[PDB]
Amino acid sequence: VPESHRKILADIADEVLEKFYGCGSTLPADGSLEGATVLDLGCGTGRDVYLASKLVGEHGKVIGVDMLDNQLEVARKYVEYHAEKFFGSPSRSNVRFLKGFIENLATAEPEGVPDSSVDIVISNCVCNLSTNKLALFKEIHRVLRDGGELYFSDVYADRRLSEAAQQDPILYGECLGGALYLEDFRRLVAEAGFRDVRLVSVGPVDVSDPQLRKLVPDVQFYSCTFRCFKVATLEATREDYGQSATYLGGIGEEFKLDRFFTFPREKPVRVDRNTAEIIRHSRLHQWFSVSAEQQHMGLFKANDSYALLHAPLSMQVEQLVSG
Ligand SMILES: [Ca+2]
């Protein structure tokens, strides 16, 4: 748990923390959340929704969605509690909880999530239990505004799992059985409208149980945090238009966009046009200066890892996990 989050979580209601299921949804840099609308898919008792409530502040909004009746009951019980805690009055909540399948946010109760209404969609380990991944990614694309991002952690494989592995109930329940091969994931989210997948962090996921392991013998599983921006002008490729971007400060000493792009305060960093357009059209434009496009110069190479930058997603992940 990040240090900045500890103080906030210490103010969240015991019952919310005690009954919260799963790992916390990882969040973009705290300062970048100010005034944003955040949607947590699979919100449970609302631990992450309440954490985000404080971070987005009074001008931001947070929405949680879940289909677990009894978790949502807990979440809804504490709307006033956390409005008092964070904003000085029980009437000043910026959160709401909706009941629905994450594969159809338009039919959630008591209200659906509108088109183009959300800045950041967050989630942890929800995909591999989804009954329809493509439908889910399409829904996420629909609710995001232009410049918004899906910033999420899930489990992926370095190869395609066998049918036997995909049918196993213990692997299923562990979020392993439903894991996609990283290249299949890339193609699926591209079909949904997400043209550029950025790797934020990656850790290994072990399957040591010998019985289960026999179903996935040489598979390497990874926990990956990706950010996928909805930006109309993105291309499938990372092209050089001679641009630089400079982080202006205000939301940390540096801004780390992904494993390839770190922006020190007030220093220019050369960027490909997709990265430029992400900064310009997303909420990040508030803290950045991005130079004008020049003539196309070909593929972007002005990065100390440019070869990996253009490599398949499996190569980025395997090489960045460690060593
Ligand atoms: Ca969750």
Domain ranges of the chain: 1-236, 237-323
211 Cα to the center of ligand 1, angstroms: 28
Contact of 151 with 194, CB cutoff 8 Å: no
288 Cα to the center of ligand 1, angstroms: 31
Residues ≥6 apart with Cβ < 8 Å to 238: 196, 272, 273, 274, 275, 299, 300, 309, 310
265 Cα to the center of ligand 1, angstroms: 33
Cα separation, 142 vs 135, whole angstroms: 10
26 Cα to the center of ligand 1, angstroms: 10
Contact of 23 with 40, CB cutoff 8 Å: no
297 Cα to the center of ligand 1, angstroms: 43
126 Cα to the center of ligand 1, angstroms: 7
Cα separation, 286 vs 284, whole angstroms: 5
318 annotated ligand binder: yes
Residue 53 tokens read as 């409530």
295 annotated ligand binder: no
Contact of 111 with 100, CB cutoff 8 Å: no
Judging by beta carbons within 10 Å of its beta carbon (0-12, 13-18, 19+), is residue 156 exposed, middle or buried?
Answer: buried
Segment holding 264, helix H or strand E? strand 262-264
Which residues, listed in sequence order, are joined to residue 39 by a DSSP beta bridge? Answer: 63, 121
68 Cα to the center of ligand 1, angstroms: 11
1-236 and 237-323 in the same fold? no
Residue 66 tokens read as 């879940």
What was the elucidation method? X-ray
Rg (CA), the chain: 20
Residue 121 tokens read as 């969609």
44 Cα to the center of ligand 1, angstroms: 6
Segment holding 255, helix H or strand E? strand 254-256
201 Cα to the center of ligand 1, angstroms: 18
Q: State whether CATH 3.40.50.150 applies to domain 1-236.
A: yes
What number of residues does the chain have? 323
Amino acid residing at 259:
R
Cα separation, 78 vs 72, whole angstroms: 10
247 annotated ligand binder: no
The CATH fold assigned to 237-323 is: Ribosomal Protein L9; domain 1 (3.40.5)
- Considering all CA atoms of the chain, what is the largest pairwise distance in Å, rounded to the nearest integer? 58
42 annotated ligand binder: yes
Selection from 46, 150, 23, 139 nearest residue 96 by Cα: 46
